[PDB]
Amino acid sequence: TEQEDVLAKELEDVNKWGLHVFRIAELSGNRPLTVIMHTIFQERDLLKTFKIPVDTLITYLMTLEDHYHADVAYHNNIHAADVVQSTHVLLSTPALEAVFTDLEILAAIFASAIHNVDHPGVSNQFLINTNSELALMYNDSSVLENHHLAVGFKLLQEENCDIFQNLTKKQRQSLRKMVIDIVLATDMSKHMNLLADLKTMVETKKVTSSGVLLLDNYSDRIQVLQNMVHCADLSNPTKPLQLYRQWTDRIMEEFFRQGDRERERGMEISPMCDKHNASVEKSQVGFIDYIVHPLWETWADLVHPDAQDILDTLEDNREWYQSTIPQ
Amino acid sequence: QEDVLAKELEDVNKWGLHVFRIAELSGNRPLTVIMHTIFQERDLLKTFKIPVDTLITYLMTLEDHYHADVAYHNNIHAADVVQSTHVLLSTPALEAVFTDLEILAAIFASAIHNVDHPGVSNQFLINTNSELALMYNDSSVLENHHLAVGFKLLQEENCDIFQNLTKKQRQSLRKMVIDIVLATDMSKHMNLLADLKTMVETKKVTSSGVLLLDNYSDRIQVLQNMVHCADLSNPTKPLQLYRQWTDRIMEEFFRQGDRERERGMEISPMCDKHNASVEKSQVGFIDYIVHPLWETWADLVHPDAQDILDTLEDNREWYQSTIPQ
Ligand SMILES: Nc1ncnc2c1ncn2[C@@H]1O[C@@H]2COP(=O)(O)O[C@H]2[C@H]1O
Ligand SMILES: Nc1ncnc2c1ncn2[C@@H]1O[C@@H]2COP(=O)(O)O[C@H]2[C@H]1O
Ligand SMILES: [Zn+2]
Ligand SMILES: [Zn+2]
């Protein structure tokens, strides 16, 4: 019964990188997305700011969480909760103080919460190559991302689920656009272009009298939020090793299952999905070297020196995985 | 009747085909009869081993999904865009520039480009928080839907007209069609035209004046513009046809405006029947959209599009003359 006290204790670390999200998932009876989102909304006073009825928020969150699949090892409600909490921490970085409006903050967090809802455990390419109904619906482009958005928004229409019921028409319109822009940017096929623009921004960065980042147009503002959520989505390798390894174990299980389906169909097996020819350690070093570090090193420069500890952890984790290779 | 229809279809290769007459003489099956005629004309059934019964079955099914109660965006418009693309594909300057598969894609794309159109615009669907807009995240809403429906119908009993195409040919065709239809989104017109101009400025042709394309990027770009031109070809057709198209689109527009007014929404351009100037609208449409596009296409295939451009300018002059004062 006092399990509630332990859960409440763990939630006290909501503003910290390295939150025990798996512990929270268990303590909450598999409701990590609901309790973490609720905690963050309270912390940021979002219910008051946007006049969100608490029962409406909880009802929508439970419904949203219900639409993530419990039988998918990585792309589930725990991942959603993790991305939400990570985005929440990134939004609080000193270099971004007073930069974003409450609506933009709300957009980034909501986008993080719905960014992978109803994920089937297989990639866009798998869905395209197998002529899936989802790929048919979305014409082979940002198939899953479009779906995550459609489901996330559609659920707002369920009984007592419209958490944005008291926003003005203009606020709702702006929020919807920002959320779409953010989730569509999580498509890995857009990673290189997204990173290229972030690098350009860092190279031409301008700060205010306080040293805080200066963003004076939608293009730049949405770009930072897109990269912020993308960094959160790719934050596993930057977390304490015990968390990172659990995430890796989970994604490998999901990858291997996709590989088994591809093999059975006579399809070429996707990278990292062949359990018979796998090099988990080498794959993590590659993932960090070619994707995660290039991105995070750039984000760290944008908010320097705010993310130095996060970058240090990432580099330590890369060294650790690399050390398991010299055989 | 079947004799009259057969005779009208004899001009399938001519700009200005009596598409409305064909729609009447075919029991409102202009898309099916015109697509079939074009496929036979290009020997596409034998080339891609397309069972006649399969093609007809798919075509009738596709045509059935265009709304007969929508004045403009219906099966007649689809048939007209298909026939217009078919003629533009026979442009001397583009002779032998495209493969049979690419030709099949351009024509297929034209046939399905507006399927299941509800009679209202993307902006209307977005502003009314429609299910379509919810599904497609306010991004090229109708275009995405037209493609989804067009492809899904191929899965109906005896409707897979691409059944005998190789796995790669099917993948290639699907990609080209998506690329083409998404390009019909008017919100992409200015960028599409801008890039067309760029192509014209650096174009390269043979001694005989045949256009030289170097890769898929070039070939698909020309195809996107070709179909876009076909979609915006009404003002370049014989006046009798152009006026019928205008009457039809205005009716569709006014009906949308009535819905916007009732909902308390801002009425879209040309949709307010109480403050409408049809003639002035046509002149503006030609001056800012249609002429700039066709003048550019004309240069690309110079001088094969001169007659089309001449007709457009004649129609512009006529519509302007219907404006008093
Ligand atoms: N721990 C991880 N190890 C390897 N690849 C990962 C890991 N976390 C995320 N990814 C990859 O990063 C991608 C981010 O977007 P997706 O969820 O589409 O797919 C994810 C994987 O391809
Ligand atoms: N005859 C016409 N008169 C006015 N506008 C037209 C005419 N034909 C096409 N259009 C416009 O061109 C657009 C082409 O794409 P849409 O069908 O989305 O919407 C069409 C109209 O906005
Ligand atoms: Zn994710
Ligand atoms: Zn059209």
Length of chain B equals 325
Any A CB within 8 A of B115 CB: no
Instruction: Tell me whether residues A138 and B144 touch, CB distance under 8 A.
Output: yes
Domains in chain B with CATH codes: 1-325 (1.10.1300.10)
In three-state secondary structure terms, B271 is coil
Residue A277 per-residue DSSP state: S
By Cβ distance, the residue of B136, B151, B175 closest to A136 is B151
Across the interface, of B138, B174, B178, the residue whose CB is closest to A180 is: B138
Distance separating alpha carbons of residues A307 and A93, to the nearest angstrom: 8
Q: Which of B135, B175, B182 sits opposite A150 (nearest CB)?
A: B135
Ligand 2: residues whose CB is within 6 Å? B 186, 231-232, 234, 245-246, 249, 282, 285
Please report, for residues A127, A269, A317, B17, the alpha-carbon distance to residue A264 in angstroms, rounded to integers and kept in the order given.
15, 10, 35, 52
A139 at interface of B, judged by CB pairs closer than 8 A: yes
Give alpha helix (H) positions in chain B. 2-8, 19-25, 30-41, 44-47, 52-64, 75-88, 100-112, 122-127, 131-136, 141-152, 167-182, 189-201, 216-231, 239-263, 278-285, 291-300, 306-321
> Which alpha helices (H) appear in A185-272, and where do they start and end?
191-203, 218-233, 241-264
Ligand 2 atom with the smallest distance to the CA of B73 is 17
SS3 A51: coil
Contacts of B263 in chain A (CB under 8 A): none
Output the six-digit token pair for A82.
């993790």
Whether A241 contacts A196, CB under 8 Å: no
Number of H helices, E strands in chain A: 17, 0
Which two structure tokens, joined as six digits, stand for A258? 């996709």
Peptide bond into B303 cis (omega under 30): yes
Residues 169-188 of chain B whose Cβ lies under 8 A from any Cβ of chain A:
174-175, 178, 182
What does this entry list as its resolution, in Å?
1.6
Active-site residue identified among A38, A67, A69, A75: A75
φ/ψ region of A311 (left if φ > 0, alpha if ψ in -120 to 50, else beta) reads alpha
Ligand 4 centroid to residue B39 C-alpha, Å: 20
**Residue A235 CA, ligand 3 centroid: distance in Å:** 10
CA A159 to CA A222: how far, in whole Å?
Answer: 31
Closest CA in chain A for residue B141: A138
Residue with tokens 């598409």: B19
Asked if B137 has any chain A CB less than 8 Å from its own CB, the reply is yes
Tell me, yes or no, if B210 comes closer than 8 A to chain A by beta carbon.
no
B 214-273 residues with CB < 8 A to A: none
First to last CA, chain B: 46
Method: X-ray
- Taking an 8 Å cut-off on Cβ atoms, the answer to whether A177 and B138 are in contact is yes
- Catalytic positions of B: 73
d(CA A50, CA A106): 9
CA distances for A37 relative to A31, A34, A158, A278, A318, angstroms: 10, 5, 19, 36, 30
Residues with CB under 6 A from ligand 1: A 188, 233-234, 236, 247-248, 251, 284, 287
Structure tokens at B142: 């109708």
Atom of ligand 1 nearest to the CA of A236: 1
Measured CA to CA, the distance from residue B229 to residue B227 in angstroms comes to 5
Q: What is the dihedral of CA B215, B217, B220, B221, to 10 degrees?
A: -120
Shortest-distance ligand to the CA of residue B227: 4
B chain contacts of residue A141, beta-carbon cutoff 8 Å: 178
Asked if A139 and B152 come within 8 Å (Cβ–Cβ), the reply is no
